RNA sequence: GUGUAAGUGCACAAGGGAGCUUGACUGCGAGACGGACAUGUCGAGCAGGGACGAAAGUCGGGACUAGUGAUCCGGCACCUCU
């Protein structure tokens, strides 16, 4: 008989993030030659995918889970920068040149801005 | 009232743009920056 | 390397006391306070603005941080209130600031209340949040008696993590709240 | 923290009728605070 | 008192399902957003829906809104 | 609740708040709606020069539909016309 009175802060945060990601998906969509770079950020890791919405696939993906990018002793911003470089030349290997950056409903700053400029300086112009 | 007023350029002073405004909300002479065709750039347009 | 004594007390002995009283299945069902909100609704500020500035100074001196002016969100003719003019100030206290304000209030302000006979423990509402209101502002020594020119009470509310009135009242009593007995 | 929007903080020693020394931050510039009655000496808290 | 009325605005759907259209052709004339723009369909200043690319008009529903789309008919 | 009548819509907000700003632009405009004619309405996109944004991008007034008057005659400013 332990029923919390209201919504947990985790539920509020998840709902707000989903809602304001959907509100930005109104204008942002990915195509075959212009795919959408959607980034998901947690308190411990970051993940990025290259999504072609007209068919619903993922041409390339990168994250902090893999041990290669786990090995860098750098800070979370450094991990994001490495993830950005990894997604950048993985997309290079995928034949994709121009992308659109989907920030996934988070504020454009900190780690997200970090891997955004990391991908930008690696040759992926967007 | 919102009377029709004219905004002239600063350099060549041609009364190009016109619009209405409240003479009591902004009794002072309006200042706005607009595109001037013959000069080809963006300069402020002043009231007359 | 520095903690408010109220926070130390809650973290060390009050948490254990609540745990043994209610036998929570997991260590994060322990009810702890979240924030303390101070309201002073002027109401008469619809006539004169300087009352709002006075309330701003009162809240700034009492809480220690600049309050927020609450606008009138509905226009009512009987109170000759329209949209846009200020009505009341409000301060949200969290963390160390809330702990220190609670300690100061409990140990200083309440005994300074004239003929202070206690606070009724019936003011909780379902989720164990205590809302009580004062009448003046002289109980705090942060604000000087000669400085004031008109009494101004407030509405203190302490929203806690607790789910029931019993747990909230137990937590407040362990915190040192001077409740009556009924 | 907005720098110029809040009052000043200082080590304040709260003095009660019982003579207890209470070093804790507040906004009073006197440094040491003398208070006649508090929870330690109030009849309500002491059961009198 | 009565006797004042406004002229009819001739609103409604101009191109129905299956009709082929050219770029910029007006599809529906509406006051509200009764039909929402879909693929290759824009929205005007007065909520007028117009074709952005040639093809066949195709009426569909998306998330509970009725929408108008343009099917890119196959080149011969 | 949407400035304002009603209707059609808008909670994905077109509703509420904040930052900067003046596109409440210049030359145009494929294709259309409606219509006796004159009126009227929508418009992707191109160029110039800008605003906002990290970017994609949006902006040729306002959620839309009312707030207005043809022709003649005359005033003012500019023109490499006579």
From Swiss-Prot, chain B:
Coiled-coil ranges from the UniProt annotation: none
Return the InterPro entries for the record: Ribosomal_bL33 (IPR001705), Ribosomal_bL33_CS (IPR018264), Ribosomal_bL33_sf (IPR038584), Ribosomal_zn-bd (IPR011332)
Biological process according to GO: translation
Which SUPFAM superfamilies does its entry note? Zn-binding ribosomal proteins
Name the source's superkingdom: Bacteria
* Keyword set includes rRNA-binding: no
Q: Which Pfam families match?
A: Ribosomal_L33
Q: Does the keyword Nucleotide-binding apply?
A: no
Gene Ontology cellular-component terms listed: cytoplasm; ribonucleoprotein complex; ribosome
Alphabetized, the UniProt keywords read: Ribonucleoprotein, Ribosomal protein
GO molecular function terms listed in the Swiss-Prot or TrEMBL record: structural constituent of ribosome
Task: Spell out the family assignment given in the record's similarity comment.
Answer: Belongs to the bacterial ribosomal protein bL33 family.
- The protein here is known as Large ribosomal subunit protein bL33A
Q: Which organism is it from?
A: Mycolicibacterium smegmatis (strain ATCC 700084 / mc(2)155) (Mycobacterium smegmatis)
**The gene coding this protein:** rpmG1
UniProtKB/Swiss-Prot annotation, chain C:
Q: Family per UniProt?
A: Belongs to the universal ribosomal protein uL5 family.
List GO BP terms, alphabetically.
Answer: translation
Oligomeric state and interaction partners are given as: Part of the 50S ribosomal subunit; part of the 5S rRNA/L5/L18/L25 subcomplex. Contacts the 5S rRNA and the P site tRNA. Forms a bridge to the 30S subunit in the 70S ribosome.
Q: Which GO terms describe its cellular component?
A: ribonucleoprotein complex; ribosome
Query: Where is the signal peptide, in residue numbers?
Result: none
Q: Which PANTHER family match?
A: 60S RIBOSOMAL PROTEIN L11-RELATED (PTHR11994)
Name this protein carries in UniProt: Large ribosomal subunit protein uL5
Checking Gene3D superfamilies in the record gives: 3.30.1440.10
* Role this protein plays: This is one of the proteins that bind and probably mediate the attachment of the 5S RNA into the large ribosomal subunit, where it forms part of the central protuberance. In the 70S ribosome it contacts protein S13 of the 30S subunit (bridge B1b), connecting the 2 subunits; this bridge is implicated in subunit movement. Contacts the P site tRNA; the 5S rRNA and some of its associated proteins might help stabilize positioning of ribosome-bound tRNAs.
Q: Which UniProt keywords apply?
A: Ribonucleoprotein, Ribosomal protein, RNA-binding, rRNA-binding, tRNA-binding
Q: Which GO terms describe its molecular function?
A: rRNA binding; structural constituent of ribosome; tRNA binding
From Swiss-Prot, chain D:
Free-text remark on how the cofactor is bound:
Binds 1 zinc ion per subunit.
Q: Name one GO biological process term.
A: translation
Q: What cofactor is this protein dependent on?
A: Zn(2+)
Could you name the Gene Ontology cellular component terms for this entry? ribonucleoprotein complex; ribosome
Specify whether Metal-binding is a keyword of the entry.
yes
The entry lists its GO molecular-function terms as: metal ion binding; rRNA binding; structural constituent of ribosome
Quick one: which residues bind Zn(2+)? 16, 18, 38, 41
Query: Keywords in UniProt for this one?
Result: Metal-binding, Ribonucleoprotein, Ribosomal protein, RNA-binding, rRNA-binding, Zinc
Q: Give a yes or no for keyword DNA-binding in this entry.
A: no
Q: What does this protein do?
A: Binds the 23S rRNA.
Family listed: Belongs to the bacterial ribosomal protein bL31 family. Type A subfamily.
Q: Describe its assembly.
A: Part of the 50S ribosomal subunit.
- Give the protein's recorded name: Large ribosomal subunit protein bL31
> What organism is listed for this UniProt entry?
Mycolicibacterium smegmatis (strain ATCC 700084 / mc(2)155)
- Full-protein interval shown: 1 to 48 of 75
Swiss-Prot record, chain E:
PROSITE patterns given for it? Answer: RIBOSOMAL_L27
Q: Quote the Gene3D superfamilies the UniProt record gives.
A: 2.40.50.100
GO molecular function terms attached to this record: structural constituent of ribosome
Which GO biological-process labels does this protein carry?
Answer: translation
GO cellular component terms, A-Z? cytosolic large ribosomal subunit
> Is Magnesium given among the entry's keywords?
no
Keyword Ribosomal protein annotated? yes
* Keywords for the protein's UniProt record, in alphabetical order: Ribonucleoprotein, Ribosomal protein
Describe the family membership recorded for this protein in Swiss-Prot or TrEMBL.
Belongs to the bacterial ribosomal protein bL27 family.
| HAMAP family noted in UniProt | Ribosomal_bL27
Record's protein name: Large ribosomal subunit protein bL27
Biological classification of the source? Bacteria, Bacillati, Actinomycetota, Actinomycetes, Mycobacteriales
Give the gene symbol: rpmA
């Amino acid at each position: 008989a332990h029923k919390p009175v209201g919504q947990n802060i985790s539920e509020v945060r998840r709902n707000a993030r989903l809602r304001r990601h959907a509100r930005l998906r109104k204008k942002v969509a990915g195509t075959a030659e212009v795919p959408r770079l959607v980034v998901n950020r947690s308190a411990r890791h970051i993940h990025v995918q290259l999504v072609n919405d007209l068919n619903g696939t993922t041409l390339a993906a990168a994250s902090s889970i893999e041990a290669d990018v786990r090995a860098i002793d750098g800070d979370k911003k450094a991990h994001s920068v490495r993830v950005g470089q990894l997604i950048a030349e993985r997309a290079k290997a995928a034949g994709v040149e121009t992308v659109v950056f989907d920030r996934g409903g988070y504020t454009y700053g900190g780690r997200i801005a970090a891997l955004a400029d990391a991908a930008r300086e690696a040759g992926l112009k967007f | 009232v919102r009377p029709k007023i004219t905004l002239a350029c600063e350099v060549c002073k041609h009364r190009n743009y016109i619009t209405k405004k409240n003479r009591r909300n902004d009794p002072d002479r309006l200042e706005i920056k607009k595109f001037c065709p013959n000069c080809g750039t963006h300069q402020p347009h002043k009231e007359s | 390397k520095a903690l408010p004594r109220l926070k130390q007390r809650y973290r060390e002995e009050i948490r254990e006391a609540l745990q043994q009283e209610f036998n929570y299945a997991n260590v994060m069902q322990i009810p702890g306070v979240v924030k303390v909100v101070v309201n002073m609704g002027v109401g008469d500020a619809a006539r004169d603005a300087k009352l709002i500035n006075g309330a701003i100074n009162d809240l700034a001196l009492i809480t220690g941080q600049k309050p927020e002016v609450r606008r009138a969100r509905k226009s009512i003719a009987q109170f000759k209130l329209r949209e846009g003019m200020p009505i009341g100030a409000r301060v949200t206290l969290r963390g160390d600031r809330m702990w220190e304000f609670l300690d100061r209030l409990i140990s200083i302000a309440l005994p300074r209340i004239r003929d202070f006979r206690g606070l009724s423990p019936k003011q909780f509402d379902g989720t164990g949040n205590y809302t009580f209101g004062l009448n003046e502002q002289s109980m705090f020594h942060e604000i000087d008696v000669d400085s004031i020119d008109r009494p101004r009470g407030m509405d203190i509310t302490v929203v806690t993590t607790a789910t029931n009135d019993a747990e909230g009242r137990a937590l407040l009593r362990a915190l040192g709240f001077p409740f009556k007995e009924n | 923290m907005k720098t110029g929007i809040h009052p000043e903080y200082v080590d304040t020693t709260v003095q009660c009728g019982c003579g207890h020394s209470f070093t804790t931050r507040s906004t009073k510039q006197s440094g040491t605070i003398v208070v006649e009655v508090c929870s330690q000496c109030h009849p309500f808290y002491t059961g009198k | 008192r009565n006797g004042r009325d406004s002229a009819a605005q001739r609103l409604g759907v101009k191109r129905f399902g299956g009709q082929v259209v050219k770029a910029g052709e007006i599809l529906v004339r509406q006051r509200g957003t009764h039909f929402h723009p879909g693929v290759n369909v824009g929205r005007g200043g007065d909520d007028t829906l117009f074709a952005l690319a040639p093809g066949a008009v195709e009426f569909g529903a998306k998330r509970g809104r009725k929408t108008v789309n343009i099917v890119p008919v196959a080149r011969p």
